[PDB]
């Protein structure tokens, strides 16, 4: 009732554009362009609202009008955007996307320096508020310094961390002992551990590596091989019967009181 989840991460305007016919690289080739709310953190925040939790986004948008519409749009979806930064005169984050007639991803551009405005100084302004959430979800779009501040100031509140990409995930390597649940895919787990994840035969040693480095819980998506989960206390298994629904799933199930393995399976069904 007074239980709420806090999400710290980025909010993007996803722009998806594709031509209707073969792309003439000359003049305005008619097509269909879709604007979309995005960012890993903002997406997880929205999914938690849909799941029935009181979700607070801690993010940054620019004063660029389309920033304020991102906030409003996610607000309508349930999220308490009341606390975000509106950054004066910055481009709000966005994730440009160029699809094909087959929805085939051609090129993708990413403008997210505003993500760096989610500072420790900003987060410290809500130290009390953040320290009273039932759980904190952070993505690795924010700076090393900011994520360091979250992990250092969670006041025993569990931090679920979404690694976002192989490039952005590394900022957590030295801080796995502060992360309650980490959700890497194959490449991100390879990148973090330095151990090749060639197939199911290798997850045992990867997970063992994560735990040696203090990770409480690993939820490792192996794509087609399904999901491997591993608790430092010993419980591991496979669920082998999107990632933004997965993270929301895991965090919501935790707050709901659900055991680890049952949460992985549930979140994996929120994913599909
Ligand atoms: O580096 C990043 N790329 C893409 C995203 C966002 O993730 C979403 C897809 O899961 C999408 O909305 C994009 O903006 C991000 O947060 N960081």
Domains of the chain from N-terminus onward: 5-271 (3.40.1190.20)
DSSP string, 220-264: EE-GGG-EEEEETTS-EEEE---HHHHHHHHHHHHHHT--HHHHH
CA-CA distances (angstroms) from residue 269 to 17, 43, 233, 237, 241? 29, 17, 25, 16, 10
- List the residue whose alpha carbon is closest to atom 12 of ligand 1: 38
Pocket lining: 249 vs ligand 1, CB cutoff 6 Å: no
- List the residue whose alpha carbon is closest to atom 9 of ligand 1: 40
Paired sense of beta strands 31-38 and 12-19, if any: antiparallel
Q: Output the furthest CA–CA distance in the chain (Å, rounded).
A: 60
Residue 200's closest CA among 168, 169, 248, 237?
237
Query: In the structure encoding, which two tokens stand for residue 50, read together?
Result: 């849909």
Query: In the structure encoding, which two tokens stand for residue 252, read together?
Result: 């919501």
Q: Which atom of ligand 1 is nearest to the CA of 37?
A: 12
C-alpha to C-alpha distance for 270 and 272, rounded to whole angstroms: 6
Residue 51's closest CA among 272, 230, 246, 261?
246
C-alpha to C-alpha distance for 93 and 88, rounded to whole angstroms: 13
What separation in Å is there between the alpha carbon of 233 and the centre of ligand 1?
Answer: 32
Resolution (angstroms) equals: 2.3
Pocket lining: 118 vs ligand 1, CB cutoff 6 Å: no
Pocket lining: 47 vs ligand 1, CB cutoff 6 Å: no
Q: H-helix or E-strand containing 8? A: strand 5-8
Residue 60 CA, chain-centre distance (Å), reads 15
Asked whether the beta carbons of 182 and 176 are under 8 A apart, the reply is yes
DSSP string, 104-168: ---EEEEE-GGGGGS-HHHHHTTHHHHTTSSEEEEETTS-HHHHHHHHHT-TT--EEEE--SHHH
What separation in Å is there between the alpha carbon of 38 and the centre of ligand 1?
Answer: 6
Residue 255's closest CA among 3, 22, 2, 1?
3
Pocket lining: 5 vs ligand 1, CB cutoff 6 Å: no
Strand partners, 139: 162
What separation in Å is there between the alpha carbon of 39 and the centre of ligand 1?
Answer: 4
C-alpha to C-alpha distance for 249 and 262, rounded to whole angstroms: 11
C-alpha to C-alpha distance for 136 and 131, rounded to whole angstroms: 9
Structure-solving method? X-ray
- List the residue whose alpha carbon is closest to atom 14 of ligand 1: 39
DSSP category for residue 63: S
Give pairs for 202-208: CB < 8 Å, separation 24+. 203/228, 207/236
């Amino acid at each position: 009732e007074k239980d709420y989840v806090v999400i710290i991460g980025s909010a993007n305007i996803d722009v998806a554009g594709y031509s209707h016919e073969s792309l003439n690289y000359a003049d305005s080739n008619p097509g269909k362009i879709k604007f979309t709310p995005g960012g890993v953190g903002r997406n997880i925040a929205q999914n938690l609202a849909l799941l029935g939790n009181k979700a607070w986004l801690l993010s940054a948008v620019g004063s660029d009008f389309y920033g304020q519409s991102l906030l409003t749009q996610t607000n309508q979806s349930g999220v308490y955007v009341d606390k975000c930064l509106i950054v004066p005169g910055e481009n709000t984050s966005s994730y440009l996307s160029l699809l094909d007639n087959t929805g085939e991803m051609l090129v993708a551009i990413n403008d997210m320096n505003i993500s760096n405005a989610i500072t420790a100084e900003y987060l410290a302004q809500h130290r009390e508020f953040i320290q009273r959430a039932k759980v904190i979800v952070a993505d690795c779009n924010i700076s090393e310094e900011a994520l360091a501040w979250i992990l250092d100031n969670a006041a025993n509140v569990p931090v679920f961390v979404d690694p976002v990409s192989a490039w952005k995930c590394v900022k957590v390597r030295d801080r796995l002992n502060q992360i309650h649940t980490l959700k890497p895919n194959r490449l991100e787990a390879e990148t973090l551990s330095g151990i090749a994840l060639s197939g199911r035969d290798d997850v045992a040693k990867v997970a063992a590596w994560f735990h040696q480095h203090g990770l409480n819980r690993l939820v490792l998506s192996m794509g087609g091989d399904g999901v491997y989960y591993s608790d430092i206390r010993g419980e591991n298994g496979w669920s082998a019967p999107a990632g933004d629904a997965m993270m929301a799933g895991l965090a919501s199930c935790w707050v709901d009181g659900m055991p680890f393995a049952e949460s992985v399976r549930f979140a994996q069904g929120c994913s599909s």
